[PDB]
């Protein structure tokens, strides 16, 4: 909510600057590879009719947002878990500890994990994420929704990812860095500081996707509240 309103302001500001109408567009001068995200969604699978939405983060951790609004996350060590209930209660445990209260959901999570590992490509596989406190909280998927053109994924660290179905382009927006990472059709990745994009401008494709992004963040804030 705090991070989302900040994201909305940052997007309203860049779009208000009409970055694609600059007489001298200099997109490259808005890049800042130091702002590369730590986390993004590399895979997802929509089983919402029965169980929920499963996903994998670029660090090979997996998570599930169950239909009952709980979330279960399995770290990339294959054993550490974080469970978040609908009221917000979080717990840390291990699969190997055999938690009686969670074996069904662990089994479902493992089903999701095996589906994605065998069938799906890893988004951003050509990217080494930024170095953070590898030591600090793994985010979880706070909410998601689909439109006819994209899937919108909102992470608990405030990031918002939008994957476009038609051309496989993707945006990863981070309100903490006020940055956007754009993955184009050719899977080339560029990270921009939004404030620099306002000075230097950008191409019509990125400008259009950023207008769409503002609309989706607007929808995210409205549904939350």
């Amino acid at each position: 909510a705090a991070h989302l309103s900040d994201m909305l302001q940052q997007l309203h500001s860049v779009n208000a600057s009409k970055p694609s109408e600059r007489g001298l567009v200099r997109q490259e001068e808005a890049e800042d590879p130091a702002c590369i995200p730590i986390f993004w969604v590399s895979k997802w699978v929509d089983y919402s009719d029965k169980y929920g939405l499963g996903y994998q983060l670029c660090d090979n951790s997996v998570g599930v947002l169950f239909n009952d609004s709980t979330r279960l996350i399995l770290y990339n060590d294959g054993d550490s878990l974080q469970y978040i209930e609908r009221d917000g209660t979080e717990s840390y445990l291990t699969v190997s500890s055999h938690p009686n209260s969670l074996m069904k959901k662990i089994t479902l999570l493992k089903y999701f994990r095996n589906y994605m590992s065998e069938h799906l490509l890893k988004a951003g596989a050509n990217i080494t994420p930024r170095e953070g406190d590898e030591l600090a909280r793994l985010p979880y998927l706070r909410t998601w929704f689909r439109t006819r053109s994209a899937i919108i994924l909102h992470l608990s660290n405030g990031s918002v990812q939008i994957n476009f179905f038609q051309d496989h382009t993707k945006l990863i927006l981070c309100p903490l860095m006020a940055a956007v990472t754009y993955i184009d059709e050719k899977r080339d990745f560029r990270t921009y500081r939004l404030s620099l994009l306002e000075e230097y401008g950008c191409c019509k494709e990125l400008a259009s996707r950023l207008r769409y992004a503002r609309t989706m963040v607007d929808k995210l804030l409205s549904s939350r509240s």
């Binding site: 969604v41 590399s42 895979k43 997802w44 699978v45 929509d46 490509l121 899937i151 994957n163």
Partner: peptide
Amino acid sequence: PLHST
């Protein structure tokens, strides 16, 4: 789409 690429 029911799943990513």
